[PDB]
Write a protein that binds this ligand. Structure first.
Ligand SMILES: OC[C@H]1O[C@H](O[C@@H]2[C@@H](O)[C@@H](O)O[C@H](CO)[C@@H]2O)[C@H](O)[C@@H](O)[C@H]1O
Ligand SMILES: OC[C@H]1O[C@H](O[C@@H]2[C@@H](O)[C@H](O)O[C@H](CO)[C@@H]2O)[C@H](O)[C@@H](O)[C@H]1O
Ligand SMILES: OC[C@H]1O[C@H](O[C@@H]2[C@@H](O)[C@H](O)O[C@H](CO)[C@@H]2O)[C@H](O)[C@@H](O)[C@H]1O
Ligand SMILES: OC[C@H]1O[C@H](O[C@@H]2[C@@H](O)[C@H](O)O[C@H](CO)[C@@H]2O)[C@H](O)[C@@H](O)[C@H]1O
Ligand SMILES: [Ca+2]
Ligand SMILES: [Ca+2]
Ligand SMILES: [Ca+2]
Ligand SMILES: [Ca+2]
Ligand SMILES: [Mn+2]
Ligand SMILES: [Mn+2]
Ligand SMILES: [Mn+2]
Ligand SMILES: [Mn+2]
Lengths: 232, 232, 232, 232
């Protein structure tokens, strides 16, 4: 079978295994900081440089994958803790939307909240224009930040969060399990047909954004990934 | 929220947090060995001693959980490498079925393969009496070892296998990610209504079995777990 | 290593991880209330349901533990604010003393003040029959409410109190740090050989009590714990 | 009672409340990075700017204190993960030793390993010249990096570590509890007469160092502190 597998205990710019877009930067501690605290409508995204083949036009087979990552969001004076981080999957040529306003678009959608991507968002601000729930939340997005589904969550400033994601191609189910500083686990799952929503080859990554008054530290600390596609 | 969480990097015979049943034994290296290589129809099970409320009768709420564990199965002469291991959930009064014939029952069912439990099996022998697929496989079991669903897999003697399981209460989806020796991942997911199949309080654990001619080393090396039930 | 770690941010009566004894009750806010304000000689205790092995007869090793908890004691008309709360450790079979008179016994000892337990008391009433110092105090008890050692302290009605306790097995030192509302910390430490005073298997918990004329609200708000026993 | 209390959830290169010495820097994420990964024999230290009065020349009384802090150490290509971090107490005029060679001195002592300070070290390299134990370890130091006492420990690269320290003045005992990545807690306690070893007013802080071939990321993420001196 065809398998893609990698693991980042730390990140470093100048490492070809990753694409850097927007205001992203890598701190001396190896952490990826997606947004620039000193910019309006800041937007930063990171992508595994190598495109991953998630499905086949020859066989119709779709890959299954298991990926885990840890991130950290932390408040700062004197802006609102916004806007959040989104782990996403998109066409290999994906780029930050032209004239991106950042903010609630999480750096992957247009002003209306649309784009070509599937992702899991960790939202820390309620944008009514995208029908966000009243509190912080984890959401499953399919070509829109107006989540197909969300679950109440709480972004704890300064806390390291661990996420586990399983995509079962057979049932087309994307399951997500997220850590919480208080010890609880939060989960959300959703049937998502990657073959119908995304091209055969895609890029996986992370994006985060802020606005004029909405800014916070967005860090990606580690990331492991393994996908397997049955070939014939 | 009511949460039960723990993390076992190794095991010990004296830990009251673990219920030992049957032929289970603890090796000097901290590994748990489930079956006795010298006994016929051997059955050994290990359960977390703390009952877990997977659902509430008062609120109707159902918990979600994340758990990971690693195990190892190793051949031995001159017996057939059987029968396998099963990660299961059962009522808190659960015990090895009286008069258990072990073998293909995996220590959780009767001769007919029926029982009161939900589990994920790592089956290394094809029992036609339970409609097993022809090769080694991972299966989702609901009150029977005649799996509700299975996926082809391969048990490599002496290999360490990493497993990640996510149960999303909202969708009632049980997702399993199995990371093989060769690096490939294998997944299987199934909608299982724990609230409809099990009581409010249950126990989680592992069971393994053998027959007269089928015997192998069944080891549980580690186990982390977190389940959360929304209360109040 | 053998480790036991849990973290209660709040409580619930149906949570199997907690043994309730006596007049204990759970408030809608998740707080545990140990005594019954309307009962003479009230006694209420709460225990972590699972036995904790604090030392091994096979290795002679004793565990170290770090535990933090917050409680609150508030006066009421027209009773004297008594008698206090005690964080204790005792045999796994520990029950409220038969015919307990509550009051100065704190629900862990008999009339003479003797019992089988080790604990840190937050005493708010001076019982001369137990040689209490003249004012409120924190004390280290070993099989008796006639403290092996005490330190002047002040129980502020309605004040939330935080406590951190460290037990270093190697030095057998039980160190306590109490953070009052006014910000000051109060500490007391005492060498206590848990191995010599307690059985290998014990249970940790809290107890509070009152008399006919001595009653007050005793609340346990949170409790985190981690013990580690070196296994060799 | 004279109480000194503070809390840092993040730091900033501009808050005078902290003295920055040597190569220390403050990252955009609010973390303090003690050493410069690009410098030979790098040394960085941070001190709470306000001197703390730990004892009275009038009463002879000594203060008790409770402090908690979190840190992180991560490896880097292609140097040995060294040398570690030390939480220390020293005269208010304390400065990095003249002509410091960094390395095993941890930035608080001369070449022989001598200095004027009391501290808890999180050592990640075995210096025979200072009688270090063979593995990583937590040590209690008194005017020397040739620890008065040590306990085996393990520094996990990329892991956030929480530490809690209690100093009980009456028993002159310094107790430490370290919360590791795998869940276990590591403790060490030692009687240290602060009044006999340190001046009336001191500064508390953190220090880390590296050498030519020994370098790693030394981060301080947070730090809470409370000390109380009884005045009669
Ligand atoms: O506060 C941060 C947020 O900023 C923007 O949201 C609104 C803004 O449109 C306007 O309504 O004013 C309020 C309060 O001043 C908010 O700032 C972004 O649209 C959000 O994404 C978020 O960053
Ligand atoms: O061979 C291991 C195997 O033993 C038992 O079943 C087999 C059966 O499938 C085969 O047809 O015949 C042999 C010899 O009579 C055994 O009966 C167990 O039931 C099975 O689980 C496995 O352990
Ligand atoms: O007042 C509350 C107090 O009641 C009981 O003791 C007192 C005793 O200290 C006092 O001297 O006399 C009264 C009247 O007889 C009570 O005996 C409890 O023993 C004590 O713990 C406290 O609850
Ligand atoms: O390798 C990091 C390590 O360097 C130094 O330790 C010894 C050094 O004293 C000795 O002379 O040579 C060996 C190998 O070249 C090591 O470098 C530092 O003293 C030590 O603190 C640590 O930083
Ligand atoms: Ca939003
Ligand atoms: Ca079978
Ligand atoms: Ca008393
Ligand atoms: Ca050293
Ligand atoms: Mn959203
Ligand atoms: Mn089967
Ligand atoms: Mn007392
Ligand atoms: Mn050392």
């Amino acid at each position: 079978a065809e398998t893609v597998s990698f693991n980042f205990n730390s990140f470093s710019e100048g490492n070809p295994a990753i694409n850097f877009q927007g205001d992203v930067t890598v701190l001396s501690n190896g952490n990826i900081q997606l947004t620039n605290l000193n910019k309006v409508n800041s937007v930063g995204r990171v992508l595994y440089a190598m495109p991953v083949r998630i499905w086949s036009s020859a066989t119709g087979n779709v890959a299954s994958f298991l990926t885990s990552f840890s991130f950290e969001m932390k408040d700062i004076k004197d802006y609102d803790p916004a806007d959040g981080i989104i782990f996403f999957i998109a066409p290999e040529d994906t780029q930050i939307p032209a004239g991106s306003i950042g903010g609630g678009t999480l750096g992957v959608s247009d002003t209306k909240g649309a784009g070509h991507f599937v992702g899991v968002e960790f939202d820390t601000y309620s944008n009514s224009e995208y029908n966000d729930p009243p509190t912080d939340h984890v959401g499953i997005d399919v070509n829109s930040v107006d989540s197909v589904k969300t679950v109440p969550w709480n972004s704890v400033s300064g806390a390291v969060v661990k996420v586990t994601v399983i995509y079962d191609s057979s049932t087309k189910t994307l399951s997500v399990a997220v850590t919480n500083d208080n010890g609880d686990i939060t989960t959300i799952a959703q049937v998502v047909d990657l073959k119908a929503k995304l091209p055969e080859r895609v890029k996986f990554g992370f994006s985060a954004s802020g606005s004029l008054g909405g800014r916070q530290i967005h860090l990606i600390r580690s990331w492991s990934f393994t996908s397997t596609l049955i070939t014939t």
